[PDB]
Amino acid sequence: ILIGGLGLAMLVALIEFCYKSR
Amino acid sequence: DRGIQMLITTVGAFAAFSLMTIAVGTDYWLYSRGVCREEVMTHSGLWRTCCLEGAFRGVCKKIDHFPDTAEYLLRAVRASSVFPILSVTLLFFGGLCVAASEFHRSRHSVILSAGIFFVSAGLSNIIGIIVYISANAGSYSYGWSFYFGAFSFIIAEIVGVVAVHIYIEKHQQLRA
């Protein structure tokens, strides 16, 4: 669950970054 | 420290990749009692198990991973060793990005990509180790191949941090 959450966190960070970019 | 940062990044990328590749290749993960055919002391890697004392000393055999759906998935994942291999793949791509970053100085994100690859490699590595340990125990000791994997993890994470620092410094210097 820990490593899953770290993966998920990175994914959400990418999504939010792309959203704030455009 | 810019030149030194890039030197650390490149050396570290190569070191992490080399250590992880050797670890995945070599066969000194585990020291335990078994048979490569009474059972003698042996050493196992991810694939081969080999006796290191007796008549059949130096003999090797493919591990029978498959001699409970969760147990089946663990056995599958540990048989393919998808996670150590994925760690090697991502270290390779990170190293390639670090090499490329030297060319395309216009596009910063290249080095950031390197960073992310290395960090991700570290995570896959840790999953690997857990899966490996979880599957095995389901006496003994760990060989130098195991510790190569562990040191690969540490170096990968350090190089990821340094890479992201490089990108941060680029986007900070640009604002100034």
Binding site: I1, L2, I3, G4, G5, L6, L8, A9, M10, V12, A13, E16, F17, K20 | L112, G115, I116, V119, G122, L123, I126, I129, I130, I133, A150, F153, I154, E157, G160, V161, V164, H165, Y167, I168, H171
Partner: protein, 79 residues
């Protein structure tokens, strides 16, 4: 007499759990740093502060700083 043994306080958990705790600690600290920084909207969670946040979270000693983003909060919550 079974002499306790200097590092016998580690005995409740296997050696592999302790080693994996250390690795997880590093991975958490690095991911918290990464998801807190490369977001160029903001850029206090540098690497050293990330390590301190994670250490204090594990020892249940709390923190000077908490993550404010969604990504930092996911990382923090699973840790």
């Amino acid at each position: 007499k079974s002499k306790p043994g200097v590092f016998s306080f580690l005995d409740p958990l296997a050696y592999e759990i302790w080693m994996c705790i250390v690795f997880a600690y590093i991975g958490v600290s690095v991911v918290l740093f990464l998801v807190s920084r490369f977001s160029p909207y903001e850029w206090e969670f540098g690497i050293f502060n990330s390590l301190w946040f994670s250490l204090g979270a594990f020892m249940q000693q709390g923190c000077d700083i908490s993550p404010r983003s969604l990504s930092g909060r996911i990382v923090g919550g699973v840790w």
